[PDB]
Amino acid sequence: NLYFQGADSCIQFTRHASDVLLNLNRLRSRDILTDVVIVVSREQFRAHKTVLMACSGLFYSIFTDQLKCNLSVINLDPEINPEGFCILLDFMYTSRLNLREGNIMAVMATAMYLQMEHVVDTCRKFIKASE
Amino acid sequence: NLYFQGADSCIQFTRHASDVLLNLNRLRSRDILTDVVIVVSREQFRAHKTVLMACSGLFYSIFTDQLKCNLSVINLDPEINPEGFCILLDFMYTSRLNLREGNIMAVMATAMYLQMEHVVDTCRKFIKASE
Ligand SMILES: [Cl-]
Ligand SMILES: [Cl-]
């Protein structure tokens, strides 16, 4: 089946959470109900605020701030690597982190700035083994 | 670990999709960046439009319509069971469908109206066995 009897007294759907994520990424690709532009240097990234808050400590702190919550444009540190930000934004919407020899230092730096501890620790483990 | 080497050339996070969903539901509980009220009879339900679109064919068709996309209040058929709608909205944010003897006919009716085919079929399978 596509369902199971859960630990509690409830039916649970195995692929629902991943299907929601697939569909939110389809909304992103088509620029449907995106409500913010993240600007890193000269590059821009359109996204959904709630997805950003659900993945990053920094975006949650930003969009829970009463002054900043309704801003349509958010500028990040111009020192942040745009490729490293792109890889992380793609991870947020797909669960796949395209970690390579060339990008690993910039992805770790960006995830530290974005407060994405799971990705931060995973980068460290791959750096300790590649040494 | 919390990651695996995927089918493609990429690292994938096992719990990411479910963690995103847990966090979007925490945003809902706290009424953070909810952008629509769904009104069923006298009851109201606050939600995030993108979550609704990612789960229901009806909400996707509604919020992709240029006239209706920026509406903050959506009224459903006053004949729709509020309990049945509540169970489905909770499923959307949790993956758990609290299906009971008393609610199964109203949950199926509501999921048909909301174009949630996975839930519709699952209701039918439980009705064919309970007969
Ligand atoms: Cl079962
Ligand atoms: Cl691995």
UniProtKB/Swiss-Prot annotation, chains A, B:
Give the disease association: Chromosomal aberrations involving BCL6 are a cause of B-cell non-Hodgkin lymphomas (B-cell NHL), including diffuse large B-cell lymphoma and follicular lymphoma. Approximately 40% of diffuse large B-cell lymphomas and 5 to 10% of follicular lymphomas are associated with chromosomal translocations that deregulate expression of BCL6 by juxtaposing heterologous promoters to the BCL6 coding domain. Translocation t(3;14)(q27;q32). Translocation t(3;22)(q27;q11) with immunoglobulin gene regions. Translocation t(3;7)(q27;p12) with IKZF1 gene 5'non-coding region. A chromosomal aberration involving BCL6 may be a cause of a form of B-cell leukemia. Translocation t(3;11)(q27;q23) with POU2AF1/OBF1.
* Domain notes from UniProt: The BTB domain mediates homodimerization. Its dimer interface mediates peptide binding such as to corepressors BCOR and NCOR2. Interaction with corepressors through the BTB domain is needed to facilitate the rapid proliferation and survival of GC B-cells but is not involved in the T(FH) formation and BCL6-mediated suppression of T(H)2 and T(H)17 differentiationrequired for GC formation.
Outcome following mutation: residue 61 to A: Abolished ubiquitination by the SCF(FBXL17) complex
Q: What is this protein called?
A: B-cell lymphoma 6 protein
- Give the multimer and partner information: Homodimer. Interacts (via BTB domain) with the corepressors BCOR, NCOR1 and SMRT/NCOR2; the interactions are direct. Forms preferably ternary complexes with BCOR and SMRT/NCOR2 on target gene promoters but, on enhancer elements, interacts with SMRT/NCOR2 and HDAC3 to repress proximal gene expression. Interacts with histone deacetylases HDAC2, HDAC5 and HDAC9 (via the catalytic domain). Interacts with ZBTB7 and BCL6B. Interacts with SCF(FBXO11) complex; the interaction is independent of phosphorylation and promotes ubiquitination.
Q: Which cysteines are joined by disulfide bonds?
A: none
Instruction: Name the source organism.
Output: Homo sapiens
Underlying gene: BCL6
What does the entry report about post-translational modification of this chain? Phosphorylated by ATM in response to genotoxic stress. Phosphorylation induces its degradation by ubiquitin/proteasome pathway. Polyubiquitinated. Polyubiquitinated by SCF(FBXO11), leading to its degradation by the proteasome. Ubiquitinated by the SCF(FBXL17) complex, leading to its degradation by the proteasome: ubiquitination by the SCF(FBXL17) complex takes place when aberrant BTB domain dimers are formed.
- Reported impact of residue 23 to K: Abolishes interaction with NCOR2 and HDAC2, no effect on interaction with CTBP1 and transcriptional autoinhibition
Induction remarks: Down-regulated during maturation of dendritic cells by selective stimuli such as bacterial lipopolysaccharides (LPS), CD40LG and zymosan. Protein levels decreases upon genotoxic stress in a dose- and time-dependent way.
Tell me what happens on changing residue 118 to A. Answer: Abolishes interaction with NCOR2 and HDAC2, no effect on interaction with CTBP1 and transcriptional autoinhibition
Top-rank taxon: Eukaryota
> Which locations, inside or outside the cell, does it occupy?
Nucleus
The organs and tissues expressing this protein are described as: Expressed in germinal center T- and B-cells and in primary immature dendritic cells.
Q: Which residues form the BTB domain?
A: 34-101
Parent-record interval covered: 5 to 129 of 706
Q: What does this protein do?
A: Transcriptional repressor mainly required for germinal center (GC) formation and antibody affinity maturation which has different mechanisms of action specific to the lineage and biological functions. Forms complexes with different corepressors and histone deacetylases to repress the transcriptional expression of different subsets of target genes. Represses its target genes by binding directly to the DNA sequence 5'-TTCCTAGAA-3' (BCL6-binding site) or indirectly by repressing the transcriptional activity of transcription factors.
